[PDB]
């Protein structure tokens, strides 16, 4: 399988040239082309003149791609395709992907940018934005190499929110996501420092002590955040290594007893309060349903999701969180899909996507919610796995390949980031497509 | 690798349920009611455990709920029914262990597991909502665990839609459900309306897309079965298949191109011969597998063509000229590659895709209770599915709960539930037909 290029330094956000489309009548290419110009990246554009313009407008050079050229590679190709008005125009696609479909480079991004179906002002165009998803998915499984395929949907005027997300999948950074659906909603835009987009946040992580938690841990901080490094008293040695490795600190307490949340406040008082919360403390207790026994499944959606709900409540109702301030849940493939012996962690890690959509309509602020779903994530633990799930997991995916901690710790990091105003209410997989779902 | 187990399907009206249900409802449940008067309807031994406030609402609608010793772990269940409405906030979801843990290896083979909620969007608290979301992981878990052919569902009902839950509860209950495990079905208010559930499609006039073969014949069987009267539609090379369909069901015959711009013309014209058109069922679709790279655009537009936009042409002629009978029915046929992708149908599964959103937003602007409603089938055995590779085919055939292919009468009579003259409060739902598989977004 391929080895999938991850996040080096935060110049340059892509290595490569792109090359950028757009359907008749699209409203997002101005914004498109804002990003690529502040990136600083090797631009091409074909034969559309309302796009050129477009870029010109915001001073984007964009360099003519000959169409008669099949040699030349794109690290990333990105296509506005809100100007698609109905299920007849779907075919504006085929025109800018079939002639460049072996010219992606590996590790490569297909990229597109859509109007989020609800917001669509027809229902025409609502359907046909929606169609983009079932391409994009057929893609994601069809170009190989490493290549990631997402759709961002951007509601009707949020074309503002965009870069964020923009960055991200074209980045490296975004090595283990495809597949996938992510929106953006309209938000003020902040000032952010694009290479610490955390720079003078403070986190809170939990779980922290090792394994994804640790790795989350170590993105926050590289984004320039300082991070609370949070587990149980037991596991206070590997608490101080983290948070020495890191330049964090450390709070030792059961993230689910009753006074988790104000013993969080109180942590955070001493850093300016608290900006960012990763709900990553979890565990499996894979039974089952005939075998487990009652305090097996009460454990599960307890560490797994009311202790999460008792610490936001908490800190949503008492000041706890920052203006701006953001919260990061950790689902699962598995409360996406279901599995055998999972009755409790998939019930648990669905509600947490529950959690998720029903919170971030009711949040002030400015601040945010979404979570993770991690696919198969190899960890220190793997092996401990069943042989026959294990290797399932490894290799179903459109990758080939289980993904790496530091794939989720990107995610959520950029969740986290300052400039993710209009990131809110996505629960975003994980899992290099994984072939499992609903 | 062991051997499928075979899967009980429809074989006559009665009974409902061929064998026990079990009922359970979580404390302070609001749908057990109505589940009750479904039970008492359907005329089935039904069992109870030690719930007193589930026994004396069973009561009020004149079903006698009989006590199941719960230390019988001996006795088998066709059916389990939960109502799980009752669950105000997660840690209320034991609730579910309470009531399966005890009984999960006394559900019988080709059995059901149907856990019945509030649609979260629906729910007055947000800790209420969250629980609710809740029990699609839980059942997706039951589906893939439980084995033995037995099938998995949450219906969620919106806040004051009790009365509307009987078609669907039924469907559930029955082996015409066979294939459909996993899956989340949503249950909306609307007016109840008399039925003769024996014939749910009695004095009504459907038309089937791609009715001469394959899964659209099995579709005019089952809907002329339920008592339709069924106009079948194909292209008039399929002339003499369209007649032999048309003479084994009773029906009549319609031989166009349902691309043609006056397509929809012709079938309100056709339909006006038997008191217009009640139900039509977009069945007709291809595929035209390539790699993006190797596709031609015609091989494009084609497949967008068939499966999607002659389906939004017709539609829009049948609403704008009313062409569809009050309390009408329009079932769409999408796929699970329009949910998940496939490699070689960028064009199959944008289509597919398309039909998704076709049901989710012309949901919300029909009148005169007129529904849309989508299966969507994983994989069915039929005569196109020789072209596939045997192991693609294999592959298919193994990689769900059920552990083998489903039939075409699986798919059609998922579309028979949604046209039935009952299923009123069933409108905007995507319900996969699928045995579980494995494959999803």
């Given at each position: 399988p391929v080895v999938l290029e991850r996040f080096e330094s935060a110049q340059p956000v892509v290595?490569?040239?792109?090359?950028?489309?757009?359907?008749?009548?699209?409203?997002?290419?101005?914004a498109i082309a804002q990003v690529l110009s502040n990136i600083h990246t090797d631009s091409y554009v074909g034969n559309n003149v309302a796009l050129q313009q477009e870029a010109a407008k915001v001073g984007l050079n964009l360099?003519?791609?000959?169409?008669?050229?099949?040699?030349?590679?794109?690290?990333?190709?990105?296509?506005?395709?809100?100007?698609?008005?109905?299920?007849?125009?779907?075919?504006?696609?085929?025109?800018?992907?079939?002639?460049?479909?072996?010219?992606?480079?590996?590790?490569?991004?297909?990229?597109?940018?859509?109007?989020?179906?609800?917001?669509?002002?027809?229902?025409?165009?609502?359907?046909?934005?929606?169609?983009?998803?079932?391409?994009?998915?057929?893609?994601?499984?069809?170009?190989?190499?490493?290549?990631?395929?997402?759709?961002?949907?951007?509601?009707?005027?949020?074309?503002?929110?965009?870069?964020?997300?923009?960055?991200?999948?074209?980045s490296p950074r975004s090595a283990y996501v495809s597949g996938q659906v992510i929106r953006v909603?309209?938000?003020?835009?902040?000032?952010v420092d694009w290479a610490k987009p955390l720079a003078g946040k403070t986190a809170l992580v939990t779980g922290a002590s090792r394994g994804i938690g640790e790795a989350i841990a170590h993105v926050l901080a590289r984004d320039g955040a300082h991070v609370i490094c949070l587990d149980v008293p037991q596991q206070q040695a590997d608490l101080d290594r983290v948070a020495a490795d890191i330049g964090?600190?450390?709070?030792?307490?059961?993230?689910?007893?009753?006074?988790?949340?104000?013993?969080?406040?109180?942590?955070?008082?001493?850093?300016?309060?608290?900006?960012?919360?990763?709900?990553?403390?979890?565990?499996?207790?894979?039974?089952?349903?005939?075998?487990?026994?009652?305090?097996?499944?009460?454990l599960v959606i307890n560490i797994n999701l009311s202790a999460a709900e008792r610490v936001n409540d908490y800190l949503l109702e008492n000041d706890g969180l920052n203006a701006n301030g953001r919260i990061v849940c950790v689902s699962s493939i598995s409360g996406i899909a279901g599995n055998l012996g999972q009755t409790n962690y998939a019930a648990s890690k669905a509600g947490v996507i529950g959690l998720?959509?029903?919170?971030?309509?009711?949040?002030?602020?400015?601040?945010?919610?979404?979570?993770?779903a991690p696919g198969f994530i190899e960890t220190q633990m793997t092996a401990a796995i069943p042989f026959a799930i294990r290797?399932?997991?490894?290799?179903?995916?459109?990758?080939?390949?289980?993904?790496?901690?530091?794939?989720?710790?990107?995610?959520?990091?950029?969740?986290?980031?300052?400039?993710?105003?209009?990131?809110?209410?996505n629960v975003v997989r994980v899992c290099g497509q994984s072939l499992l779902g609903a």
């Open positions: 290595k490569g040239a792109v090359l950028v489309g757009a359907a008749p009548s699209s409203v997002l290419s101005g360099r003519p791609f000959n169409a008669g050229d099949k040699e030349s590679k794109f690290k990333a190709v990105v296509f506005d395709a809100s100007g698609i008005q109905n299920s007849e125009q779907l075919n504006e696609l085929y025109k800018f992907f079939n002639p460049i479909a072996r010219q992606v480079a590996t590790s490569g991004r297909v990229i597109v940018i859509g109007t989020t179906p609800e917001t669509a002002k027809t229902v025409k165009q609502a359907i046909a934005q929606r169609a983009l998803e079932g391409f994009i998915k057929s893609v994601g499984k069809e170009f190989k190499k490493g290549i990631t395929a997402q759709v961002v949907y951007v509601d009707e005027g949020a074309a503002a929110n965009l870069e964020s997300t923009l960055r991200f999948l074209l909603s309209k938000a003020d835009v902040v000032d964090g600190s450390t709070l030792a307490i059961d993230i689910t007893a009753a006074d988790a949340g104000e013993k969080i406040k109180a942590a955070a008082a001493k850093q300016g309060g608290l900006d960012i919360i990763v709900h990553n403390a979890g565990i499996t207790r894979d039974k089952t349903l005939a075998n487990m026994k009652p305090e097996l499944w009460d998720v959509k029903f919170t971030a309509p009711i949040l002030k602020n400015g601040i945010t919610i979404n979570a993770v290797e399932a997991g490894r290799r179903m995916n459109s990758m080939q390949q289980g993904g790496l901690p530091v794939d989720v710790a990107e995610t959520i990091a950029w969740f986290a980031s300052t400039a993710s105003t209009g990131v809110n209410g």
